[PDB]
Design a binder for this molecule. Structure first.
Ligand SMILES: Cc1nc(Nc2ncc(C(=O)Nc3c(C)cccc3Cl)s2)cc(N2CCN(CCO)CC2)n1
Ligand SMILES: [Cl-]
Ligand SMILES: [Cl-]
Length: 288
C-alpha cells in the first residue's frame, strides 16, 4: 500500500500546484498539516471535526485550520464537503469576511486554513453575560451588513448568519464566516441547497423559498439576541411570533427607537418587503 500525496482544493481552475512548506517532506508519513504547522490550541470541535489555532511554518503567521473528522464516505460525501471551499472562494477577500488562505485534502480529510480571528460573537456575549452596549451592536450590525451586501450583490446567499458564525476583530469590528451553506443563486447546484440553524431561520424558508432576504432576517434575529441578551426560542408560539412581525416588549424595552426601527425593517415577514443590506447601510444611522 502506497499513499496519495496531499493536494490543494480549489475551484478556480488554475494549474494544479503541488503542496510545499518549510518543515514538509512528502516522503515522510506525517500529514502536511502535522509537518507544516505548529499546533497551538484547539478553538472548537463538532461532528464535522476540529478547528485549531496554528502557526504556519511557511510565513510564521497565526491561522485557524479546520480539519474534518474522518475520511470521505464516498464521492458525493467528498463533493459536498469540498464545496465549502468553492463557496468560500466565491466570497473572495473582504474586510468583514473571514479570509480563506488555502485548502487541501489528504487521506480523505479536508483542511481549510483561514486567517485567525478573535472569538465568535456567541462566545463574546456568553462571556459578557448581559446585553451588549448599543454602540457595540451598531458596529457589528454595520460590519455584518457590509459582508452581506458584498455577498448579495454577487447573487450569493449565506443561509446561516448567527452569532456562532461571526468573529470579532480589533476595535469593535467583526467578520462573517462559515460559508459551508452558502449558495450562488441562479446557477448550477440548486439541488444541494439547505437551510441554516432553525433558531435564526427566515419565515419564507418554511415554504421552501429563499433569496438574499433570508440573510437579512437571520441577521435581524442575531442582532436582537445580542442586543437584548435574549434566548431565542427553538419553536412554538414564541418562534412563530418572531416570524410575524412582533417583538417581545419585555426583552426589548431597552433598545433605542433607531435600533428598534432597524430590527423591524430586518424582521419584516414578507421577503419582498424586507429591507436589503444595501438600503440599511444607506440609512443615516449606519452612515455615522
Ligand atoms: C472558536 C474560536 N475561534 C477563534 N478564532 C477563529 N478564527 C477563525 C476561525 C474559523 O472558524 N475559521 C474558519 C475555518 C478554519 C474554516 C472554515 C470557516 C471558518 Cl470561519 S475561529 C478564537 C476563539 N477564541 C477562543 C477563546 N480565546 C483564547 C483564549 O482563551 C480567544 C479566542 N475561539
Ligand atoms: Cl493531520
Ligand atoms: Cl457518497
Amino acid at each position: 500500500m502506497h499513499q496519495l500525496q496531499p493536494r490543494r482544493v480549489s475551484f478556480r481552475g488554475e494549474a494544479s500546484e503541488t503542496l510545499q512548506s518549510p518543515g514538509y517532506d512528502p516522503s515522510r508519513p506525517e500529514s502536511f498539516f502535522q509537518q507544516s504547522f505548529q499546533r497551538l490550541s484547539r478553538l472548537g470541535h463538532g461532528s464535522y471535526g476540529e478547528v485549531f489555532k496554528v502557526r504556519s511554518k511557511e510565513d510564521g503567521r497565526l491561522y485557524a485550520v479546520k480539519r474534518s473528522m474522518s475520511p470521505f464516505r464516498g464521492p458525493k460525501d467528498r463533493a459536498r464537503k469540498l464545496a465549502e471551499v468553492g463557496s468560500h472562494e466565491k466570497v473572495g477577500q473582504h474586510p468583514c469576511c473571514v479570509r480563506l488562505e488555502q485548502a487541501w485534502e489528504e487521506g480523505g480529510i479536508l483542511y481549510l486554513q483561514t486567517e485567525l480571528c478573535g472569538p465568535s460573537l456567541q462566545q463574546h456575549c456568553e462571556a459578557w453575560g448581559a446585553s451588549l452596549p448599543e454602540a457595540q451592536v451598531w458596529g457589528y450590525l454595520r460590519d455584518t451588513l457590509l459582508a452581506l451586501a458584498h455577498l448579495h450583490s454577487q447573487g450569493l446567499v449565506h443561509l446561516d448568519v448567527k452569532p456562532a458564525n461571526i468573529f470579532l476583530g480589533p476595535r469593535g469590528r467583526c467578520k462573517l464566516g462559515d460559508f459551508g451553506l452558502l449558495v450562488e443563486l441562479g446557477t448550477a447546484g440548486a439541488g444541494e441547497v439547505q437551510e441554516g440553524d432553525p433558531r435564526y431561520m427566515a419565515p419564507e424558508l418554511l415554504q421552501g423559498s429563499y433569496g438574499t432576504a433570508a440573510d437579512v432576517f437571520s441577521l435581524g434575529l442575531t442582532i436582537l439576541e445580542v442586543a437584548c441578551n435574549m434566548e431565542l426560542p427553538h419553536g412554538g408560539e414564541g418562534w412563530q411570533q418572531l416570524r410575524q412581525g412582533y417583538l417581545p416588549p419585555e426583552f426589548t424595552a431597552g433598545l433605542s427607537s433607531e435600533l428598534r426601527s432597524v430590527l423591524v425593517m430586518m424582521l419584516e415577514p414578507d421577503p419582498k418587503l424586507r429591507a436589503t443590506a444595501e438600503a440599511l447601510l444607506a440609512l443615516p444611522v449606519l452612515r455615522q
